[PDB]
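re: ur msg from earlier - yeah i can do the sodium ion complex, just paste it... oh wait u already did. ok heres what im feeding in:
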Amino acid sequence: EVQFKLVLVGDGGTGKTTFVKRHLTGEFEKKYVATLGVEVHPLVFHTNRGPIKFNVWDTAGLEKFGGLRDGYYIQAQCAIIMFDVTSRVTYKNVPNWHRDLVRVCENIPIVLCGNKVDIKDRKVKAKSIVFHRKKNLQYYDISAKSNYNFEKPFLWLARKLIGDPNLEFVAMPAAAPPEVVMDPALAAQYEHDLEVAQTTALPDEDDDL
Amino acid sequence: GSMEGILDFSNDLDIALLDQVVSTFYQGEGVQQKQAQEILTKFQDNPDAWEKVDQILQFSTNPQSKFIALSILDKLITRKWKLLPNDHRIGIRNFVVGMIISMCQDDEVFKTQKNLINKSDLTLVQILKQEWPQNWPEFIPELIGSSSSSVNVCENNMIVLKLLSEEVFDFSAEQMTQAKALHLKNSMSKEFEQIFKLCFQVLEQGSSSSLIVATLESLLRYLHWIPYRYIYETNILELLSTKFMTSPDTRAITLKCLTEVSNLKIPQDNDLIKRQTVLFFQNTLQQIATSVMPVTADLKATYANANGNDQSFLQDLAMFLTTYLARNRALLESDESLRELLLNAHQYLIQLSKIEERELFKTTLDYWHNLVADLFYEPLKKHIYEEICSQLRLVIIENMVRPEEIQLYKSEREVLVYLTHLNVIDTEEIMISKLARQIDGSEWSWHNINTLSWAIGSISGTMSEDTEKRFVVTVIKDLLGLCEQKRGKDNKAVVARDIMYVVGEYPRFLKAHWNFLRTVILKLFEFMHETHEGVQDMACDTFIKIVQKCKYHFVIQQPRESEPFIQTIIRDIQKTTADLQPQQVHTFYKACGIIISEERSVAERNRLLSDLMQLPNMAWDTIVEQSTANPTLLLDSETVKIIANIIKTNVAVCTSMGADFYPQLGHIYYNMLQLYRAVSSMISTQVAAEGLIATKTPKVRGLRTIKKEILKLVETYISKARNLDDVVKVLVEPLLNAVLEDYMNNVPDARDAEVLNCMTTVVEKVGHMIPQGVILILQSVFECTLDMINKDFTEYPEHRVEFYKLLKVINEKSFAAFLELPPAAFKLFVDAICWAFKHNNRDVEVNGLQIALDLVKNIERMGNVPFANEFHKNYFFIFVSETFFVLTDSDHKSGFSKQALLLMKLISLVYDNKISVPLYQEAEVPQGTSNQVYLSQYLANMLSNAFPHLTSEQIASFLSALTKQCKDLVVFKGTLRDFLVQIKEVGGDPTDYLFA
Amino acid sequence: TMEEDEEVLYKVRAKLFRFDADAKEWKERGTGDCKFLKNKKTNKVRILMRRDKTLKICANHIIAPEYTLKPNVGSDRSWVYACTADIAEGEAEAFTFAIRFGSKENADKFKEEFEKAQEINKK
Ligand SMILES: COc1cc(C(=O)NS(=O)(=O)c2ccccc2C)ccc1Cc1cn(C)c2ccc(NC(=O)OC3CCCC3)cc12
Ligand SMILES: Nc1nc2c(ncn2[C@@H]2O[C@H](COP(=O)(O)OP(=O)(O)OP(=O)(O)O)[C@@H](O)[C@H]2O)c(=O)[nH]1
Ligand SMILES: [Cl-]
Ligand SMILES: [Cl-]
Ligand SMILES: [Cl-]
Ligand SMILES: [Cl-]
Ligand SMILES: [Mg+2]
Ligand code: NA
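and the outut:
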C-alpha cells in the first residue's frame, strides 16, 4: 500500500467536506459546518494495481477559519480545487486558490471540480469554465449529492500518481460474514433502539432511491 | 502533554518543542496530529507571534517550522507593517534578504529546500509592496547586480521578479487600492528596461537549464503587460521559436510564452511585423516536426500512453495552435509559399482533436467553430481547407454526444451544420458509410449506433428538402434493416429508440409525408405497450417532440381522413395509455393539449378539451360525489393517489393550453377548493393525533401532494391567463378563502411554501385589481412566515425564498398594502428587508436588496408628505448602516453590486437635498444644519467606531470621495473596494480616495 | 471479489441507511445493487451491497433467521431491522439498518426474498 497527500481547497460552502465525508462513510451531510483550519482523513481505493491510500487534507475555505492556510499545502502530492456551479464568486476565486497552491506545490496533478451540478438553476455555465486549460488541470462537473462523477477526481489522480493510464477501481473483496447468536442480556436493549429508529423518518423520501 | 508549552508566551520559546509539534502535525496521525494542529494554529494567530520569527528562523532545524514562521511574518507585513518604526522595517527587510542569499549560496540547501526559499521570496515581495520603490529605490539595481555573482542567486532573482510581476499586474485588482496598484505598475514599468536586459542576457548566455527555465517563467508573466517592442525589436522571438523549443526542459514554458506572444497588442498595418509573426510560427512548427513528432503522428495514442509530461505538452500545443491561428491564419492564407505551413498546423489540430480527453476536445472544438463559421461567410476561403474539413466531419460525427449535454452538443451541432453546408455530399457519404459499418457489424455497438443517430439528427434543416428527403428515407430504411437483423429485445430496443430519435429530429419530412407521420404516431402508440425498460419513455418523449413541431397536422383534416387526427387520438386514449406510468400519461395529455391549442375556433377547441379531459373528469365526478357523501373515503391511500393523478393531469394540460384551459378549470374549480379544505382538515387532524411526525407519513404526504398540485394548477392558469377580469371576479376570492386562513392557522411544519408561490403569481398578474386581496394576503402570511425564518438562516428554506419573492412583488404592484400596515408591522417589514440583506443564500439576499431599492423608490414617489418624512426620520439611517454592515463584513461579497447601488441611492437623496425634513433630532446639532453635513458626521462617527484603526483623515477622504461619486456607479464601486482594502490593514493612504 | 463461490438469488437497487443514536438521525451508508448471495459450499445466504461508482461494500451480513423487517414511519418502500454482525467496515458490528427501494413492489418483493433466505439459512 502506497499513500499520497491530497489537499482539497476552495471557497467556503462549495462542498469539500461533504464530498470527502460521502467518500469516507457513504453519508450525505445536509448541514453546513465550516471546517476549522483542516480535517485530515485517510481514504483508500481498491485498484487493479492494488490499494491506494490518500491522506486527505480537507482545508477551510472561509478566511476567518483559514488556520495555517498554505502551510497545509507543504509536501502535497496532488490536489482538488473545488467551486460551486451555483455561486459565481466561487469560480471567480478559483485562480486565487490555484495561485496559493502552486506557489507551494509546483509540479502536482490537480483536478478542478465544479460541485452541485444537481441543482437546476446553474450560475456558472459550462462555456465560462476555461481556467483549467492553460493551467493543465483536469476538470469535472460533480455532485456530492447525486454522486454524478463522484469517483472521477480520485480515479484521475490515482492514474497520474501511479503512472498507469489503465488503472481501474475494482470491487474490494467481500469476506464471508460471521454467524452470531442474539445476546439474551441485550434483548430489551434492541427493542428500545429499534423503537426509536422506526419512529424517526428516513430523509429525502421524494428521491428515486 | 508538553506540546501546549509553545502557547505560553510568558516563557521564552522552546524551538525543539515547536519542531516536535510541527513534526507531529505534518507526519503524525489521528489524535496526536489533531492536537498539534490546534496548537500550531493558536501559536500562529497569537498577535505577538511575529516577535518570535527571528528566533525560529535562526535556531530551528525543521524547515516546516521556518515556513510557518514566514506565514506569521507575512500577516505582520500585509496588515500591521506601517505601525513599525523605520529602523525595525529595515531590520526585517535586511534579515529576509540575508536569509534568501544565504540559502542560495549553499548549493545543498538551494537544491533541497525549494519550499522555504519560494516562501521567503514571496515574503520579500510582500515587503516590496509596502516599501518599494519610495523606501527602497536601489532594490532593482542591487538585484540585477547580485545576479552576476552566482547562478543560484540569479535563478532565485527570476523567481522574485516573477512573483513581483504577478502581485502587481495579475492579482492587484482585488488586493490593493486603485492608486497603489497604479503606483506599483508605473514603478515596474519605469525599471523594466533594466530587468529585460538581465533576462535577455541570461537567455542569450545560456548554460544552466534551471536558470533558463526560471527566466522564461518570469517572461511568461511579463508578457501579460509589456509592450510588443521588447519581443519584436529584439532577438527574443527567434530564441523562443528555435533554441528553446528544441530542448524539452525549456519547451513547455516556451510554448506558453509564444501563446502569450500571440496575444500581444501589435501594429496591424506593418509588413515587417506581419513577417515576424509568420516566421516565429514557422520556426515553432518546424522545431515540433523535427524534435517532437511529425504531422502524421498518432497523438491519440501518445496522449493515452501518458509518458512524462506528454499530456501537458499536447494540451499546450493545442492552446498555442488555436490561439495563433484564431488571430493570424489570414497571414498564412494568400501567400502560396505559406500554404503548407497553414495546412500542417491545421493537420496537427486534427490529430489533437482525436485525443480521448473531453476538456482538450472542447478547446479544439472552440477553434473549429471559429474556422468553419469563417469559411461559411468569408469569400474564397473554403477551398483552402477542403481536406481539413473532410477529416473534421469524421472527427465530429465520431464524437457526437447526446443533446442532454447542452453546451457540448450545441457546439458540436453548430460545427457539423457549418461543415454540412460547406459540403453536403461529403457529410452524407460519411454518415451513410458509418451506417453501413453498423449493419456489417465491424463498428456495431450501442454507443456507436447512438452517437451516429445523434450526429444524423443534428444536421436536420441543413440540406435542401429534396436532398433531405432522399437522405432520411435511406437512413430509416437502413436502421429498419438493422433492427430486423438484431436479435434480443435489448438490441432491438436500442435501434428502435434510435429510429424514433432520428424521425423526431426531421419534422420537415414528417410535415410533407402525412402517411408516414400517421404510421410513426401509430407505431409510437404500439410502443407505449412495451414494458421493456426505456421504450415507453422514449415513445412518450418522441410523441410530444413530434407534436411540438408538427401540431398543425393533427388539428386539420388531412385528405383521405374522416376527421382531424386529434379526434382519433382522443377517441382511443384509454387503450393507448392503459399500460403507461402516471408521469407518462401526463406527458401524453400534455402533448394532446399542445394540439388542441392550435384549434382557434372556440367551440371546437372547448369540445376537444372536454373530450380529452373525459376520463379524468369522470373519475373526479365519482370521487367528489362519493368523497363528499362520505368524508371517510379520503383516508384511503389509493383514492388519494387517484386524486393527485387527476390534479396532475389537469396541470399537464393547463401547462400546454394556458388561457385556453379556463373552461376545464371552471368545471372543477369549486369542488377542487372544497377538496383543498377537506384535505387540510385531515392533515390538521392527523398532526394533532400523531404529532409533527405525521407530516413524514405516506398518508399525510399524499394529502399534501393534493394541496400542492391544486396550488400548482391555479398558479399555472393564472400565470398564462388572458381574461384577468374573470381571474378577479371568479377565481381570486374563493382561492384566498380556501388557502389563506388554512396557511395562517396551521403549525409551521404543516404550512406549504407553495401557498406563498401561488400568491406571488396572483399579485404579479392581478395585484393592481385586488388591493383588498393583497392586504388580506399580507395579514395572513406576513408575521407568521417572518416568525418561522427570523431565528436563524437555515430553517424553512423554501418559505424563506418564497417569502421575499412575495414581499418583492407586493412592493412592486400594491405598495398601498404596506401603507395600510400599523407602524409596528411596518417596522417588522423594514426588519425583514434588512434580515434578507444578511443572508448568504443568494435568492434571499438579492430580493432583500431589490425590495430596499424599490421601497426607497416608492417613498420618493409620494413626494413631500408626512408618511415619506416619517419614513426617512425612522429608517434612513437604519438602511444606510445595515447596507454598510453587509458591504464591510466580508461575509456578503456576492451582493456587492446591489449593496453599492442601494448605498448610492441613499447618499444621492441627501446630496440632492431630496429629503424635506432634518434627519437629526433637536438639540443634537445647530438647528439650521443641512442633512449633508449631518450624514457626513454620522458616517464618520459610525465608521470610526466600527474601524477604530482607521485615521480620521482616511474616513473623511473616503466619505468625501463617496458623496462626490454618488452619481457614477462604477467609480463609487471603485471607492467602496478601495475602502474594503484599507480596512484590512493599518496606515492606508487617504490620498488613495482621490484616484482618477 | 470473493463472490465466485456464490449464486445470486435476488438483486435489487436500494439505498441503505444506518441509525446513528448519538444524533437521533439516519445516515446514508450507500446506494447500489443489494444482492442475496447463496454460498455453494455452506448454502448460507448473505446480503452483499456495493456502492455505485466505487463498488465499496456498504452491507455484508448473514440474513439471520432471528431478524425482522419492520416498517419505517416515513416510508411505504423501506424496511428497518437490527443486524448483530455486519463486516462492511472490517470489524463485525451491530447496526440498526434501514433499506429503501424504488417502489413498494420492490420493498414487498425484497421482504418475500428475505424470508425465503431466512428459511434457507434455518437448514
Ligand atoms: C410508410 O411506410 C413505412 C413506414 C414505416 C415506419 O414509419 N416505421 S417506424 O415507426 O419508424 C419503426 C421503428 C422501429 C421499429 C419498427 C418500425 C416500423 C415502416 C415501414 C414502411 C413500409 C417500408 C418497408 N421498408 C423496407 C421501408 C423502407 C423505408 C421506408 N420509408 C418510407 O416509406 O417513408 C415515406 C416515404 C413515402 C411515404 C412513406 C418505408 C419502408
Ligand atoms: N445541492 C447540493 N448541495 C451540496 C452538494 N455538496 C454539498 N452540498 C451542500 O452544500 C454545503 C457544503 O458544505 P461543506 O461541504 O461543509 O462545505 P465546505 O466546502 O467544506 O466549506 P468550508 O469547510 O467552510 O470550506 C452543505 O450544506 C452541503 O450539504 C451537492 O453536490 N449538491
Ligand atoms: Cl442525497
Ligand atoms: Cl503600466
Ligand atoms: Cl484571422
Ligand atoms: Cl406546418
Ligand atoms: Mg469543510
Ligand atoms: Na521576529
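cool cool. Chain B has one domain: 1-996. ping me if u need the other ligands too
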